[PDB]
Design a protein that fits this description.
CATH superfamily of the largest domain: Formyl transferase, N-terminal domain
Radius of gyration: 23 Å
Strand order of the largest sheet: 3-2-1-4-5-6-7
Assembly: monomeric
CATH architecture of the largest domain: 3-Layer(aba) Sandwich
Order of helices and strands: EHEHEHEHEHEEHHHEEEEEEH
Entry title: Methionyl-tRNA formyltransferase from Vibrio cholerae
Number of strands: 13
CATH topology of the largest domain: Rossmann fold
Number of domains: 2
Largest sheet: 7 strands, mixed
Structural class: alpha/beta
Distance between the termini: 60 Å
Helix content: 25-40%
Name: Methionyl-tRNA formyltransferase
Keywords: structural genomics, Center for Structural Genomics of Infectious Diseases, csgid
PDB class: transferase
Strand content: 15-25%
Length: about 300
């Protein structure tokens, strides 16, 4: 039974701590950040586990407090602190991370969203031995899943929040037993998952419909893909692509009925299916065309 320190803050971290508390290893302390108590903090308290909340590991006091725990391992999931070398090396077996991609692809902050946005055929979780640098450490275990045509960043997050803990616990048993194997990442295949933004989520109708459709899924739940019509910002919750040679200016409404609002793009047609008018829950387009048939008249051009 490893003496484990768990470090992490939001729900994705809490799922891993929960799995560890129902396991064989001793959780001797939890490190987390405030938001309000984090979900990680609340779980720790329910199990009478000491909670530490440093702002960073710059002070000698912070490094010493960690050292005095005599940890065998620190497991780090969705924890915002930079861990310097000395901290990485404080636990007897170092620090392991659960990262939400198939490393070395999508190092960094937005791996779930970017895997979907780029149209990867699969993604997964990597259990990584943390080293100095952004997500550069050796890979101990990878678990993969297909990205389904219906997957959003929400639905994929939900799957990886289950897969991550399962993979972690399997990897931890390998470590405990002395059977883990580290694989060095190849830098030449690495890239970085840059954060999302409201500005990038504005639809450019000159893009390929396939690309807009991946955005619509990747940018759910945040920021939501959006376009402008009349004087309003409409959020797109669901769409599909229709393979159809385009002969009209991108943004032109080609067809508008219960089956879709069909919009010309730079390649193929984007069929809007569920839209959110400011104020209101997202509606099927059948309902949108009842209310505001005027904004989506055939032959008019969306911006």
């Amino acid at each position: 039974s490893l003496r484990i320190v768990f470090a992490g803050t939001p729900d994705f971290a809490a799922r891993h701590l929960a799995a560890l508390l129902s396991s064989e290893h001793e959780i001797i302390a939890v490190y987390t950040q405030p938001e309000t108590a984090s979900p990680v903090k609340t779980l720790a308290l329910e199990h009478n586990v000491p909670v530490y909340q440093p702002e960073n590991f710059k002070s000698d006091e912070s490094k010493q407090q960690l050292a005095a725990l005599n940890a065998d391992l620190m497991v780090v999931v969705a924890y915002g602190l930079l861990l310097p070398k000395v901290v990485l090396d404080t636990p007897k077996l170092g620090c392991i991370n659960v990262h939400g991609s198939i490393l070395p692809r999508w190092r960094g902050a937005a791996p779930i969203q970017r895997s979907i946005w780029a149209g990867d055929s699969e993604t997964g979780v990597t259990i990584m031995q943390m080293d100095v640098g952004l997500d550069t450490g050796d890979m101990l275990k990878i678990a993969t899943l297909p990205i389904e045509a219906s997957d959003t960043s929400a639905s994929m997050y939900d799957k990886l929040a289950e897969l991550g803990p399962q993979a972690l616990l399997e990897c931890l048993q390998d470590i405990a037993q002395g059977t883990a194997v580290a694989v060095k990442q190849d830098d030449g295949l690495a890239n970085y998952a840059h954060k999302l933004s409201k500005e990038e989520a504005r639809i450019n109708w000159s893009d390929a419909a396939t690309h807009i459709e991946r955005c619509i899924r990747a940018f759910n739940p945040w920021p939501m893909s959006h376009f402008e019509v009349a004087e309003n910002s409409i959020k797109v919750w669901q769409a599909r692509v229709e393979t159809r040679a385009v002969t009209q200016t991108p943004g032109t409404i080609i067809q508008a009925d219960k089956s879709g609002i069909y919009v010309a793009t730079g390649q193929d047609v984007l069929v809007l299916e569920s839209l959110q008018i400011p104020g209101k829950k997202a509606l099927p387009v059948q309902d949108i065309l009842n209310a505001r048939a005027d904004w989506f008249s055939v032959g008019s051009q969306l911006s």
